[PDB]
Design a protein around this ligand. Structure first.
Ligand SMILES: C=CCSC[C@H](N)C(=O)O
Ligand SMILES: C[As](C)(=O)[O-]
Lengths: 397, 370
């Protein structure tokens, strides 16, 4: 009963997706001229959606707006916990103690703070590559050392090099593993056996794990999500991070769940944080977990068709492009090995030659030569324009 | 015209004069501004890209104080308390001292203790309810080479002093003499009595790059929950440090609300000031009539009354606990303001006059029956 084909204007909303691609993609100043008006770009880069936030969420916020006062706010009642807990209960069969829950502005700030709470200045921060570049930046931020275990590209199906991973985890300075569960940008939904071996390895060398599960509700319709903490429920050194922000297009609300079993780490967190909450943000998030499931299940259906359409479009019109439909996220990961070199800048190319803004190459640290990443969380009509522009521009090269 | 008499919503039957937020509703102009952003239907990654918010806040400062600041000196914060905690670390080395005037907001002290800097206090001078600065005591403590940061509360909380131009000049010159950084906490600068002008410290010292001015729509419009405040950092070094240590994304609903506050909120604010003035006037008459040994000067700013009860209690009697148990009023008082506040209670008058009358009656009855 929803119209995901509806085009939604985003001009003049202080959205980075429309207003700041020069800085975040190209580290260039706002003067930078393009062959295309800003409005003329198909924008498929930063991971927020072109779909509208469900009206149940918007109404939940308006309901809080009608209480008419927006003073100092902490989550006093158990409403928020119960809703988020029941959401985890019925979608993954996982639960957590309420007192293990703390709130953060977003998982990125959570990562930057947790790195300093967990790692001594000379310790290392391990993660699987290619990845979301902020796993590196979180470690660079406070002069910790990012280390990478390259995944294994079996024709688009990625697996973990467990021997390389155990070797790097075993290092005594390697103290923190940042896991992306499900993985960004490959889309891997980690199977139970994969997570067991990852967790057992971290238990062997007593390595702390931050599990970034921010994409865990954007799976393909035939996939289950397993929180790592579900398999390792007594390991005090796992931190679980979840947020309604990806699922429901709520990044602006800057609210996310950080589950910290370790009593010492959690006490550290609490003593370092301004522990007030935004009432409109709590109202939106609480609405998302209470009422947002029906919209999410239709969104999952629409994302699947977009993925299936994207494979057919590429098989037909970019046949030397290698592309496996991602098991999770709304992000398409396309290998253009056969068309480009490691050293050709794919974002700059597609901006100037296709009028499409995308991410690729070393925006995902390493292990991503000649890859582009496409945001498909937009109406099928806008996506089709994007794909036509991409294939046309690559062929003409 | 606005209905400040409206009761909004209602631990049992407590009259609450706890924490500095209002019982009045946020103006409908701000709420409509948020709902308008709600209707854009998407809430993705957000930075303050357009110049609208700057223009609104810039013009607000322009036409209400005759002060302006460069757009590039403006950075955003979750609140002035977090700003205080971080700015202490960017400015003061451990082993350096953080000076402020007492009594004060206790978070001036905690901001220093937080990162193991040292809090030091210059007591204000109480001449029959009118507070003044002991300028020689202040220069003595500022002159200390380890004393690096002065946190000024302008207007002052909890006395309510609206600092006159000469007072700010002498404070500013003293800090210029010893190169002491000043954080000017000006969060109450629009909650003044109708016959008071606010002077930002930086207006008088527009070339001293070491003043940071802090302002927010939060107290003025009941918006602390939106966690948005303006921090103006002339010093390019401090500002770059600030910028490199912060997650520089904003809540679009928060930006929409603060923007609406500065664009359209002035008329409600001038109506609020009239209503606060009458509440302050009633409070004096009420206490003069029913607690005649209580010493009380109408505060020049904030919606908080500062009442001296020297004559009914000892320094050792816990006033918050007394009024909790004996009057059913939750209030702040005593040593909740670092020091220089024995036997004081602070009353929130930012509520309908009928609720204030009930609260005052309970307070007077409990003290008189003591
Ligand atoms: C240019 C800066 C980050 S863009 C990455 C995007 N937010 C994602 O999560 O895929
Ligand atoms: C929850 As987030 C703002 O780090 O996408």
């Amino acid at each position: 009963m929803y119209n995901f084909d509806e085009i939604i204007d985003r001009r003049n909303t202080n959205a980075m997706n429309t207003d700041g691609f020069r800085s975040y993609i190209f580290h260039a100043d706002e003067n930078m001229k393009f062959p295309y008006k800003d409005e003329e770009f198909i924008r498929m880069w930063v991971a927020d959606m072109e779909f509208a936030t469900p009206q149940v969420i918007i109404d939940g916020i308006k309901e809080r707006l009608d209480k008419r006062i927006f003073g100092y706010t902490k989550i006093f009642s158990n409403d928020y916990y119960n809703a988020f807990s029941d959401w985890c209960q019925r979608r993954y069969g996982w639960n957590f103690e309420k007192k293990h829950l703390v709130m953060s502005n977003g998982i990125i700030p959570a990562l930057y703070e947790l790195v300093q709470y967990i790692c001594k200045k000379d310790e290392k921060v391990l993660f699987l590559t290619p990845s979301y570049a902020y796993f590196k930046y979180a470690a660079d931020f406070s002069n910790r050392t990012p280390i990478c275990s390259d995944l294994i590209d079996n024709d688009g199906y990625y697996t973990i090099d467990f021997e390389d991973f155990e070797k790097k985890a075993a290092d005594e300075k390697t103290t923190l593993f940042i896991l992306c569960n499900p993985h960004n940008p490959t889309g891997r939904v980690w199977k139970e056996e994969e997570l067991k071996k990852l967790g057992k390895i971290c238990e062997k060398y007593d390595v702390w794990v931050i599990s970034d599960e921010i994409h865990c509700d954007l799976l393909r319709c035939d996939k289950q999500h397993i929180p790592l903490a579900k398999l390792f429920p007594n390991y005090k050194r796992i931190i679980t991070c979840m947020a309604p922000s990806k699922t429901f297009n709520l990044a602006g609300l800057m609210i996310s769940n950080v589950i910290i079993p370790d009593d010492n780490l959690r006490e550290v967190w609490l003593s370092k944080h301004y522990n007030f909450d935004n009432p409109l943000s709590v109202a939106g998030a609480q609405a998302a977990y209470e009422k947002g499931e029906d919209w999410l299940k239709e969104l999952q259906k629409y994302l699947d068709k977009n993925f299936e359409f994207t494979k057919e479009y590429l098989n037909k019109n970019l046949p030397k492009a290698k592309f496996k439909i991602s098991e999770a996220t709304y992000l398409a990961w396309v290998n253009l090995e056969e068309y480009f070199d490691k050293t050709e800048n794919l974002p700059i190319f597609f901006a100037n030659k296709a009028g499409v803004l995308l991410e690729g190459g070393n925006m995902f640290v390493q292990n991503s030569d000649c890859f582009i990443r496409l945001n498909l969380a937009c109406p099928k009509s806008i996506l089709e324009k994007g794909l036509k522009r991409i294939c046309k521009a690559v062929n003409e090269k």
